[PDB]
Amino acid sequence: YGVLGLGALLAVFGNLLVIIAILHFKQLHTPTNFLVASLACADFLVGVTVMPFSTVRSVESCWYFGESYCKFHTCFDTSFCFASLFHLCCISIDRYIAVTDPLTYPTKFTVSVSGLCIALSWFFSVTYSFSIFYTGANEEGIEELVVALTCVGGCQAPLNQNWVLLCFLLFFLPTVVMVFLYGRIFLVAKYQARKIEERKAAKTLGIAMAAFLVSWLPYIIDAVIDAYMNFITPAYVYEILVWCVYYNSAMNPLIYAFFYPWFRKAIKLIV
Ligand SMILES: [NH3+]CCc1ccccc1
């Protein structure tokens, strides 16, 4: 309790605002703002469904809720905890189309396209997960899986070497697009501040890239190499690693849709 409970409140209280204040307000019905709503829905579902159950799992060091719960609790965690990354990847593509190609931003980014990004971000991130935890492709060698995971108790979704690389590659692509489309923007926003005569572009892009890298990267990096160098990593030093991505999902509605003044201005008209 304590720290873990606070992260659950933020992931729902700080996220309910974004999903409530888009549907009700017709001033914010822009196609780019519907992607933020879908991202908010995914983060809210993380906060309501997977986080409370994983809270007790990390404080009792055992899966009290049977085995079906586990066979199920893991798969959707991997499913729509990795669906938060695709939304960031697509928001990056948004910014890139807005800035690099400014003449045709409303032409290419209609609602029809922002509706095709949500379906991809929601269905693809799920069909690959549910085909790994249930079908049994997650573990090609189960003899080592049983001793470390089942007999002691608890669930940590260990991955074998052949398939752990695939897990990594569904974080590399959501990350390679984010940095490549923010490296170019940093330069473009640099040459245009010198043209007027920079300070703000570096600060804004820094936060939008450090928040993602400081949370998702450390956990996945330690989770991809643990299928090669045996499993020397202690189980107790893994709870913080799984909670980092939960932390990231709590701050998301704060870096996006909260750091911009066009949203605070529209939401300040409550009274
Ligand atoms: N919080 C863990 C979510 C997760 C775990 C492993 C692969 C992809 C996503």
Curated annotation (Swiss-Prot):
GO terms for biological process: adenylate cyclase-activating G protein-coupled receptor signaling pathway; G protein-coupled receptor signaling pathway. Residues 56-70, 136-161, 226-238 are extracellular. Changing residue 219 to C/A/L: Abolished activation of G(s) G alpha protein in response to trace amine-binding. Changing residue 245 to T: Abolished activation in response to cadaverin- or spermidine-binding. One of its GO terms (molecular function) is trace-amine receptor activity. One of its GO terms (cellular component) is plasma membrane. Changing residue 226 to E/N: Decreased response following spermidine-binding. This is Trace amine-associated receptor 9. It comes from Mus musculus. The lineage of its organism: Eukaryota, Metazoa, Chordata, Craniata, Vertebrata. The chain holds residues 36 to 326 of 348 of the full protein.
